[PDB]
Amino acid sequence: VFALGNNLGSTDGYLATHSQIATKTSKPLLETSQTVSVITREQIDDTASKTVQQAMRYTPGIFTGQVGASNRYDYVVMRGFADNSVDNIYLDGLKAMGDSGTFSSMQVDPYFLERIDVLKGPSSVLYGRSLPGGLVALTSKKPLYEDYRQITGSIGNMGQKEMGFDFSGPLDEEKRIAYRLIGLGKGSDTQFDHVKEERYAIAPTLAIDFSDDTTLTLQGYLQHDPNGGYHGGVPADGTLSHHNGRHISREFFDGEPSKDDFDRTQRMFGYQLEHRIDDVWSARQNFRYLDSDVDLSQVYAYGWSASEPNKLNRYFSGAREHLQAYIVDNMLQAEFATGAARHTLLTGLDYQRRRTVVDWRSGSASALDAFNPVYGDDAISYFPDDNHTRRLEQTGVYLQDLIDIDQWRFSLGLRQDWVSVTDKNRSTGSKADDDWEKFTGRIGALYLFDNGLAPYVSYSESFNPNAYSDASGTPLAPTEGKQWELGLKFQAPGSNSFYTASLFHITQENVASKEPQDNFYTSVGEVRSQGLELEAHTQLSDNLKLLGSYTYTDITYTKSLDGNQGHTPNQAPKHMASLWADYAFDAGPLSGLSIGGGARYVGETWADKENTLRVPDYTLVDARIGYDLGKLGLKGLDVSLNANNLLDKDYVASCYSLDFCYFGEKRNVTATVNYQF
Numbered sequence: 177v178f179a180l181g182n183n184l185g186s187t188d189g190y191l192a193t194h195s196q197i198a199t200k201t202s203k204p205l206l207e208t209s210q211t212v213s214v215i216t217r218e219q220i221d222d223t224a225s226k227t228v229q230q231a232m233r234y235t236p237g238i239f240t241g242q243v244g245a246s247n248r249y250d251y252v253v254m255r256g257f258a259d260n261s262v263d264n265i266y267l268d269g270l271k272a273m274g275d276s277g278t279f280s281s282m283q284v285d286p287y288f289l290e291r292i293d294v295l296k297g298p299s300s301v302l303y304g305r306s307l308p309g310g311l312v313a314l315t316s317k318k319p320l321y322e323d324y325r326q327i328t329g330s331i332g333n334m335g336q337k338e339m340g341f342d343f344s345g346p347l348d349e350e351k352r353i354a355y356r357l358i359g360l361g362k363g364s365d366t367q368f369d370h371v372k373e374e375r376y377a378i379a380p381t382l383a384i385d386f387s388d389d390t391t392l393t394l395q396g397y398l399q400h401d402p403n404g405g406y407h408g409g410v411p412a413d414g415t416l417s418h419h420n421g422r423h424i425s426r427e428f429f430d431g432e433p434s435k436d437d438f439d440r441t442q443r444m445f446g447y448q449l450e451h452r453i454d455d456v457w458s459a460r461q462n463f464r465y466l467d468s469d470v471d472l473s474q475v476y477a478y479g480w481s482a483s484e485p486n487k488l489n490r491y492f493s494g495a496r497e498h499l500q501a502y503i504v505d506n507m508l509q510a511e512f513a514t515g516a517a518r519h520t521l522l523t524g525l526d527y528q529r530r531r532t533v534v535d536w537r538s539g540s541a542s543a544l545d546a547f548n549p550v551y552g553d554d555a556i557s558y559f560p561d562d563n564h565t566r567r568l569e570q571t572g573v574y575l576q577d578l579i580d581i582d583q584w585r586f587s588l589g590l591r592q593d594w595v596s597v598t599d600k601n602r603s604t605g606s607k608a609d610d611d612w613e614k615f616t617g618r619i620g621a622l623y624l625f626d627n628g629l630a631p632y633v634s635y636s637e638s639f640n641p642n643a644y645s646d647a648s649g650t651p652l653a654p655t656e657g658k659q660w661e662l663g664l665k666f667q668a669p670g671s672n673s674f675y676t677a678s679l680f681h682i683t684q685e686n687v688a689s690k691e692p693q694d695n696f697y698t699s700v701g702e703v704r705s706q707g708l709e710l711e712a713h714t715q716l717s718d719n720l721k722l723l724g725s726y727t728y729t730d731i732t733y734t735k736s737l738d739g740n741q742g743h744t745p746n747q748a749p750k751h752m753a754s755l756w757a758d759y760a761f762d763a764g765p766l767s768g769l770s771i772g773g774g775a776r777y778v779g780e781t782w783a784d785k786e787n788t789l790r791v792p793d794y795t796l797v798d799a800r801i802g803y804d805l806g807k808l809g810l811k812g813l814d815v816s817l818n819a820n821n822l823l824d825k826d827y828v829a830s831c832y833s834l835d836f837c838y839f840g841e842k843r844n845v846t847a848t849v850n851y852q853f
């Protein structure tokens with residue numbers, strides 16, 4: 177059974193019925209007063225989404241182009257909040273624990289995942305430090321109680337190859353002990369010259385039921401990326417416009433192949449302990465330890481040379497980082513009635529502790545011709561080293577009551593967080609050290625009509641430690657998010673279809689801002705994001721499945737000291753939409769065959785915060801064809817062909833500023849063979 181900390185419910189095709197993302201306890205999506213999306217394993221496989229970030233491309237309120245084609249980190253911009261977008265990811269109910277002030281952000285390979293859940297808007301009441309756009313919760317594959325065996329292989333353009341396995345089953349005749357073991361090896365050249373991606377990973381899991389009341393699940397996840405793909409950008413000047421009659425190529429590499437390394441090792445161990453005390457009382461402990469090593473060498477472009485016409489100026493970043501992090505969450509839940517009201521009352525204590533030891537290097541590199549570059553001039557003039565030890569501790573105590581009474585579904589939550597952040601500059605010996613407390617709250621009310629229509633309203637809050645520091649090196653006050661949301665969900669009690677609309681108004685306060693003059697930031701900035709999201713899952717008779725989305729987002733610097741007050745953040749489309757369909761033939765000659773595809777639309781974006789130049793809009797097309805060869809008498813064998821960006825559009829995905837613009841992925845074609853046995 178076991179509601180606490182579990183999604184439960186069911187999924188069919190692309191549609192899940194329940195989640196725990198918004199509540200830390202299984203709750204129908206239809207009866208949850210927040211916007212929640214779920215991306216199923218089937219959707220991930222059918223769209224050939226090769227990373228978490230790419231899996232989100234059909235979900236509303238999410239921009240998946242922050243660094244264009246790069247696959248090194250998962251950047252999920254939610255409701256237009258791009259800053260600290262690498263810190264939006266949770267895994268098995270626990271913050272991933274990367275350090276967004278360093279190069280040590282972790283990445284979870286999609287092959288380990290059963291599903292991806294997305295919660296929109298401020299959500300600190302259950303999770304503590306987090307961003308005002310929302311957060312993403314990955315659920316890993318868990319042990320199965322019947323023998324399961326899959327082997328999978330892929331080949332594609334851009335030198336892509338991948339082999340994986342996924343084995344699961346009971347170890348004892350009683351089916352009380354079950355294992356899963358998943359492994360993978362993959363590689364790609366990318367679109368970019370001289371670049372490699374490569375990964376090897378293994379994830380063992382063991383689940384043991386001590387009785388009907390207790391389950392312990394033991395988890396390991398070991399991942400080695402000896403190469404890190406591409407993570408660079410070039411000027412707007414020759415991408416969004418010609419530069420002396422030319423455009424920089426979408427395959428251009430601005431670095432030095434002899435001095436281009438990204439080596440990331442992620443070692444995780446953890447456990448989940450689920451204990452039913454009573455039909456009333458349940459308790460759960462989720463734990464994860466993380467230890468990672470990252471080594472980086474990168475020569476990158478930064479603007480055009482003032483003396484040499486078609487050459488880009490370049491610089492060098494170098495890093496050796498070691499991250500350690502502990503995270504535990506302790507939950508105790510009472511479910512009980514008091515006359516006509518049912519209460520699901522949760523109390524929790526969570527604890528995060530992170531240390532990141534970083535040795536950073538930087539310098540000046542030789543200039544490079546942006547067309548016809550000549551590689552090999554890799555000498556760096558180094559600038560002064562910059563070594564730090566960065567520490568974070570967060571303790572949270574939280575309370576939530578889900579109250580169902582008649583057709584009303586109410587949610588009430590409060591959390592107190594004690595946060596301590598320290599940054600020891602090991603080069604200079606000086607130490608910044610700060611401590612503070614924050615209280616966050618949430619209130620939701622939803623009315624469930626018996627035809628399956630559910631209007632709701634939610635008020636919800638968030639906070640996050642400020643990435644900036646003041647006139648004394650001491651970090652500014654944490655940023656804060658506050659959101660009003662009004663929504664409507666619909667599922668007809670018949671259907672395997674689900675439809676939602678959400679309207680939102682988010683304010684983020686204490687954002688760092690400064691006059692151009694000054695060197696010190698103050699926490700007087702404010703950002704406002706408001707808009708509309710529409711999501712539709714329409715599934716007809718187990719052979720035609722559709723998903724579609726529309727997003728309207730109006731985000732603005734409502735208070736800024738730097739000249740940009742009233743401007744729109746860059747990397748924030750006002751309009752996005754998407755539509756994906758998949759058709760399976762089930763009888764007749766063609767049976768076993770499936771055809772699918774979709775289109776994604778991203779509206780215009782500002783290339784810069786000064787709002788002087790637009791990144792054009794783009795529409796991308798995806799397609800798939802699958803065949804179950806079991807129909808020719810080889811059960812468990814199937815093949816598929818995918819093409820993302822089928823028309824091979826060559827475009828700029830977004831820009832961070834006028835200096836750094838990113839190309840979108842070219843056409844990506846993969847062929848896959850899956851063997852069950």
Ligand SMILES: CCCCCCCCCO[C@@H]1O[C@H](CO)[C@@H](O)[C@H](O)[C@H]1O
Pocket residue numbers: 346347348355356357380381382
């Ligand atoms: C956490 C990773 C653990 C990997 C486990 C190795 C694979 C399982 C070992 O073989 C299994 O032994 C059992 C009898 O003892 C049988 O039930 C089963 O039929 C048989 O195939």
Ligand SMILES: CCCCCCCCCO[C@@H]1O[C@H](CO)[C@@H](O)[C@H](O)[C@H]1O
Pocket residue numbers: 335337338339340341359360361362363364365372373374
């Ligand atoms: C669990 C079993 C794993 C099996 C391994 C599958 C293939 C892994 C591909 O790795 C590497 O890709 C690089 C980048 O393109 C190439 O430079 C290199 O030549 C190649 O060796």
Ligand SMILES: CCCCCCCCCO[C@@H]1O[C@H](CO)[C@@H](O)[C@H](O)[C@H]1O
Pocket residue numbers: 449450451459460461506507508523524525573
């Ligand atoms: C303000 C108090 C904060 C809430 C405390 C939450 C306690 C939950 C601790 O974990 C659970 O507790 C059980 C104890 O019975 C054990 O089975 C096991 O440790 C785990 O399952």
Ligand SMILES: CCCCCCCCCO[C@@H]1O[C@H](CO)[C@@H](O)[C@H](O)[C@H]1O
Pocket residue numbers: 500501502529530531567
């Ligand atoms: C609650 C028990 C968790 C302690 C061990 C892992 C915590 C994650 C960060 O590790 C760091 O390890 C250093 C060891 O030299 C110490 O400075 C200190 O422990 C901590 O800053």
Ligand SMILES: CCCCCCCCCO[C@@H]1O[C@H](CO)[C@@H](O)[C@H](O)[C@H]1O
Pocket residue numbers: 463504506525526527571
């Ligand atoms: C062997 C590793 C697994 C251990 C399981 C940890 C038990 C859960 C209680 O967490 C504790 O919460 C406190 C908040 O008051 C922190 O101050 C303290 O440091 C932290 O440890």
Ligand SMILES: CCCCCCCCCO[C@@H]1O[C@H](CO)[C@@H](O)[C@H](O)[C@H]1O
Pocket residue numbers: 571573593594595596611612613
């Ligand atoms: C059972 C959970 C209780 C909290 C556990 C953490 C140890 C006590 C925290 O003391 C300190 O108090 C300061 C102001 O008084 C806060 O601003 C700051 O964050 C914190 O360092």
Ligand SMILES: CCCCCCCCCO[C@@H]1O[C@H](CO)[C@@H](O)[C@H](O)[C@H]1O
Pocket residue numbers: 581582584621633
């Ligand atoms: C954000 C919206 C606020 C909703 C207002 C609170 C509704 C309380 C739940 O009870 C409802 O209303 C009557 C109140 O007396 C009851 O008689 C009856 O049980 C039920 O119909």
Ligand SMILES: CCCCCCCCCO[C@@H]1O[C@H](CO)[C@@H](O)[C@H](O)[C@H]1O
Pocket residue numbers: 631632633662663664677678679
């Ligand atoms: C295509 C556009 C779809 C619009 C989607 C948003 C619908 C939000 C409804 O929320 C409800 O609003 C009513 C009036 O306030 C009240 O019943 C209550 O306040 C609140 O529960």
Ligand SMILES: CCCCCCCCCO[C@@H]1O[C@H](CO)[C@@H](O)[C@H](O)[C@H]1O
Pocket residue numbers: 658660661662679680681683706707
């Ligand atoms: C538009 C989507 C539906 C939600 C509507 C709820 C009311 C929105 C207004 O919110 C408030 O507006 C003021 C603007 O300065 C401030 O009081 C504060 O910053 C903010 O909290």
Ligand SMILES: CCCCCCCCCO[C@@H]1O[C@H](CO)[C@@H](O)[C@H](O)[C@H]1O
Pocket residue numbers: 743744748749750751779780781782
């Ligand atoms: C479904 C397709 C409809 C497309 C209509 C084109 C409008 C594109 C909107 O760009 C936005 O225009 C605002 C001023 O109008 C700027 O504030 C905002 O800064 C900017 O991002």
Ligand SMILES: CCCCCCCCCO[C@@H]1O[C@H](CO)[C@@H](O)[C@H](O)[C@H]1O
Pocket residue numbers: 333334799800801817818819824843845
């Ligand atoms: C649902 C399946 C749709 C199949 C897509 C048809 C287009 C096939 C052509 O693509 C190109 O093939 C080259 C090698 O032939 C690659 O090197 C190149 O990089 C790739 O762009």
Ligand code: NA
Pocket residue numbers: 209210211212295296297634661
């Ligand atoms: Na929400």
Ligand code: NA
Pocket residue numbers: 373374375401403404405
């Ligand atoms: Na990689």
